[PDB]
Amino acid sequence: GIPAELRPGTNQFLTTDDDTAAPILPGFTPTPTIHIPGEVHSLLELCRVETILEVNNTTEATGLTRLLIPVSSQNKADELCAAFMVDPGRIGPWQSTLVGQICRYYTQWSGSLKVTFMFTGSFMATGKMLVAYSPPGSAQPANRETAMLGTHVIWDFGLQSSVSLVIPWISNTHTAGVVTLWYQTNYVVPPETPGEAYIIAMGAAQDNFTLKICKDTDEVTQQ
């Protein structure tokens, strides 16, 4: 018969309480586990996978061709081929990726990203292309010179058919910085070969990407 008193908080049902409950079936042992391949532990294993960005999300486009950058001929040097934002948790090209769907369940994020391009075109067609990162603050550059003064990679269509640019540290609490994509020289093509190819853009997180404060999503229009 130990003396005791009750304090405020008695008989309350806290939602996020870590409290055990009485079992319904005592002594009942469940089914033993087997070694099922592909066990995941945290959502950071899902953010580190490459995923096609939907950069061609403009109108009058069908379903699949919204994932393709139209790198055509009949164009010219120092020309803007394609540009997009960096924000994963924002309405844009980063909504179709997986890190953009995961980072919306949570309200804060940080870390560096990685954007990898891949050229789908003929083997006999070559040509140089300037990818350029411009950090936050200053907006998308207007000419090629201002783009190559920032962060840039001059990727040719030689043996390197897949370039990869790392985006440093872009975070939540913020413009956001622009990834621009310029025609360096041309798109040269020999005869008996179409002068129109594509580029698939993909994007993922890095080991520094971390998350905090989980809230509800809004990609559901139902209850």
Partner: protein, 217 residues
């Protein structure tokens, strides 16, 4: 060639009698070539029902009622040096094909038939490849084991996939374990006077096959 091991695990035997043929079932079964064109959509294959009618493996998989095996995949897509395009090959565990309709009522809502869910040895084509015919976008389908068949880098892909199931043994007749999908993300382009269509050849090998419970016909 680069081998992408599915989930980083090798197909192994069952831990502690089920038979192990090891002689005539571990051979390179080769399906018919698929004709990839400009206006194609994609193809999918439900694996443990592709080889249920093909030779000794089909005989020894229909006359039993237990089944556990892996697969060594091989997808050769040989084209000329002037064609251009890209394919995405990927395995998907428990790839359930959805139905296309606008009905919420149970007995009148559409459902895929036997030939649509179980194509057999000839496969089947997609209807809406942007959503994988399952309401799931193709942009993040790279979460599965996958390779890009780029028509300017290589022409082959291999997916050594282990046994992915909740129960260590299962029937190989009424349960298709996992599916293969090939999708032309970048369409085919070529100048006039070239080969109009590209063949796609698939060869599979049932690594580490185990059957249990012989049943006489």
């Amino acid at each position: 060639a680069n081998i992408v091991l599915a989930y980083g695990e090798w197909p192994e035997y069952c831990p502690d009698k089920p038979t192990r043929p090891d002689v005539s079932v571990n051979r390179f079964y080769t399906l018919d070539s698929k004709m990839w064109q400009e206006n194609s959509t994609g193809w999918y294959w439900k694996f443990p029902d592709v080889l249920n009618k093909t030779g000794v493996f089909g005989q020894n998989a229909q006359f039993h009622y237990l089944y556990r095996s892996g697969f060594c995949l091989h997808v050769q897509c040989n084209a000329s040096k002037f064609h251009q395009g890209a394919l995405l090959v990927a395995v998907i565990p428990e790839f359930v094909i959805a139905g296309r309709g606008s009905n919420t009522k149970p007995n009148e809502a559409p459902h895929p038939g036997f030939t649509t869910t179980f194509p057999g040895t000839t496969g089947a084509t997609f209807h809406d490849p942007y959503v994988l015919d399952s309401g799931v976008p193709l942009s993040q389908a790279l979460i599965y084991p996958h390779q890009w068949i780029n028509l300017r880098t290589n022409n082959c892909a291999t997916v050594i996939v282990p046994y992915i199931n909740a129960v260590p043994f299962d029937s190989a007749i009424n349960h298709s374990n996992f599916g293969l999908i090939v999708i032309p993300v970048s369409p085919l382009k070529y100048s006039s006077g070239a080969t109009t269509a590209i063949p796609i050849t698939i060869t599979i090998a049932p690594l580490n096959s185990e059957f249990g419970g012989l049943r006489q016909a």
